Amino acid sequence: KVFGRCELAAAMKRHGLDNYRGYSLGNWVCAAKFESNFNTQATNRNTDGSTDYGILQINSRWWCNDGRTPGSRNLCNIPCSALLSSDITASVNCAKKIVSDGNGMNAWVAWRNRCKGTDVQAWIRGCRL
Ligand SMILES: [Cl-]
Ligand SMILES: [Tb+3]
């Protein structure tokens, strides 16, 4: 599923991401845009052999099991393929655990380099929220 901008903002809001760990909704929508272009099926291989999955490009090195990241962890206790579903529940619940780690949203490279310090509210402008 390729979400529309406001559609993703509404789903994220419903699942409790808006202001989660102090990050406004626009931060999450901006991160999803530059991580996956709002595509739940996005996958990207990393140089170390782990893979990033889904709308928020969650890494198999720590957070999900894909069966091909030797010596990795599965801190969200889910198969990585659950993060590719049309239903963002799994990705949202796992993102809440990631942003609760020491570095907050800096865990998302595209957020730090393309969203952080920008007018993030522009990512929800015009949406009926
Ligand atoms: Cl915002
Ligand atoms: Tb940690």
Curated annotation (Swiss-Prot):
Q: In which tissues is it expressed?
A: In the egg white and polymorphonuclear leukocytes.
InterPro entries the UniProt entry points to: Glyco_hydro_22, Glyco_hydro_22_CS, Glyco_hydro_22_lys, Lysozyme-like_dom_sf
Q: Name one Pfam family in it.
A: Lys
Domain named C-type lysozyme is located at 1-129
Q: What class of enzyme is it?
A: hydrolase
Task: Locate the residues binding substrate.
Answer: 101
Annotated keywords: Allergen, Antimicrobial, Bacteriolytic enzyme, Disulfide bond, Glycosidase, Hydrolase, Secreted, Signal
Top-level taxon in the UniProt lineage: Eukaryota
Q: Which reaction does it catalyse?
A: Hydrolysis of (1->4)-beta-linkages between N-acetylmuramic acid and N-acetyl-D-glucosamine residues in a peptidoglycan and between N-acetyl-D-glucosamine residues in chitodextrins
Q: What does this protein do?
A: Lysozymes have primarily a bacteriolytic function; those in tissues and body fluids are associated with the monocyte-macrophage system and enhance the activity of immunoagents. Has bacteriolytic activity against M.luteus.
Assembly, per entry? Monomer.
Remaining remarks = Lysozyme C is capable of both hydrolysis and transglycosylation; it also shows a slight esterase activity. It acts rapidly on both peptide-substituted and unsubstituted peptidoglycan, and slowly on chitin oligosaccharides.
Supply the name of the protein.
Answer: Lysozyme C
Q: Which organism is it from?
A: Gallus gallus
